[PDB]
Amino acid sequence: SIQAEEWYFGKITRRESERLLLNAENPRGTFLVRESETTKGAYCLSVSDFDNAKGLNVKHYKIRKLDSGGFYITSRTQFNSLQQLVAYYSKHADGLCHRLTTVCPT
Ligand SMILES: N#Cc1ccc2cccc(OP(=O)(O)O)c2n1
Numbered sequence: 001s002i003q004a005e006e007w008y009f010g011k012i013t014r015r016e017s018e019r020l021l022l023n024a025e026n027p028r029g030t031f032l033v034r035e036s037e038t039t040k041g042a043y044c045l046s047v048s049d050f051d052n053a054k055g056l057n058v059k060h061y062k063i064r065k066l067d068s069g070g071f072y073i074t075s076r077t078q079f080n081s082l083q084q085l086v087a088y089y090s091k092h093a094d095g096l097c098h099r100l101t102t103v104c105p106t
Pocket of ligand 1: 013035037060062
């Protein structure tokens with residue numbers, strides 16, 4: 001169960017995920033998974049990034065879950081679980097601003 005996962009912050013807003021992630025000490029790829037504020041049955045993967053242009057900033061990717069069972073940010077790349085998705089994205093940047101590195105501190 002994802003609710004048991006330490007990177008699962010459940011019902012928090014986008015602003016709040018940005019408040020937690022916009023901390024000077026978070027390295028690129030700090031992340032958390034939360035509920036989508038407006039897309040039901042979707043989660044949101046909030047991820048911190050950093051570059052000399054934008055400085056420290058956050059990106060939000062919608063995680064869809066099919067009734068067919070798979071989870072995904074892009075339908076081309078599916079997984080049997082949220083946990084597997086997270087693990088995959090901890091190893092590949094793909095279309096993300098950065099590979100998942102560290103669970104957003106509280
Ligand atoms: N599409 C879209 C879309 C566009 C703007 C959004 C603003 C706040 C929260 C949202 O949902 P989320 O970040 O997924 O919690 C949004 N979703």
